[PDB]
Structures are given as structure tokens and as C-alpha cells.
Ligand binder design. Structure first.
Ligand code: NA
Length: 126
């Protein structure tokens, strides 16, 4: 089982993103879902997660800027990110934990988020 991220790419400093993850589709059983990130050479760190019951946890660097939600009608876990900073640049990975068991964790493939105003203005034709 591999999940499928979308919504990454280039974004200006101060800009916003809507990250999405197509999960396993096994809505017949509960799960925890969330988002990690990994910057080159650095350790993976928790960005946001939801327990089986919908309790949210956020990495300390989030500082109220990101919101995690899940859509069971659409089989997704989503991350709404505002006020992106250069330091947020990293590969973002979603995950699903069947029955809340991290031991059975499914991961996405990762999607790059690059926070750069000059690059985003160039690429998005602003
Ligand atoms: Na942008």
C-alpha cells in the first residue's frame, strides 16, 4: 500500500498550499493519518496528524499556520498550509496507520514543497 500526495510544488514565501493524500480506501476500519516532512540530510519530523478519533497534533514549527483535516467520503487526508517560510522547504509525506497502529504504517511517495517567492513568481507567471 502506497498513498498518493498532491498539491506540492513551488509557492511564494507567505503563500498557501492545499496538500492532499489519497489514502488506502479502507474506510471500513479506523485509522490515524498525518503528514511528515524531510529536508535534505535532516531527520524526518512530524508536521500534523489525526488519531483514529480525530485528535490533532502539530509539529512545534507549525505555530498555527497549518490545519489538518480528513475526508472519508473522498478517502483523503489534507493539509491546508498558510504563511509558508523558506524553512518549510522539504519533501512532505502522508501516512495512514491502520487501526491507529504505527507498526502497520502506510506511506506516500512524498511530494516536494519549495518555498521561494522569486521561483514561484517565475513559474506561476505572476
Ligand atoms: Na504561490
Amino acid at each position: 500500500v502506497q498513498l498518493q500526495e498532491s498539491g506540492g510544488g513551488l509557492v511564494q514565501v507567505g503563500g498557501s498550499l492545499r496538500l492532499s493524500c489519497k489514502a488506502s480506501g479502507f474506510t471500513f476500519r479506523s485509522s490515524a493519518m498525518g503528514w511528515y516532512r524531510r529536508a535534505p540530510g535532516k531527520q524526518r519530523e512530524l508536521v500534523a496528524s489525526l488519531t483514529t478519533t480525530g485528535t490533532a497534533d502539530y509539529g512545534d514549527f507549525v505555530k498555527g499556520r497549518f490545519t489538518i483535516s480528513r475526508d472519508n467520503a473522498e478517502n483523503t487526508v489534507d493539509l491546508h498550509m498558510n504563511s509558508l517560510k523558506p524553512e518549510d522547504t522539504a519533501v512532505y509525506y502522508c501516512h495512514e496507520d491502520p487501526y491507529g497502529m504505527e507498526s502497520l504504517r502506510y506511506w506516500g511517495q512524498g511530494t516536494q514543497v519549495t518555498v521561494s517567492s522569486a521561483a514561484a513568481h517565475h513559474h506561476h507567471h505572476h
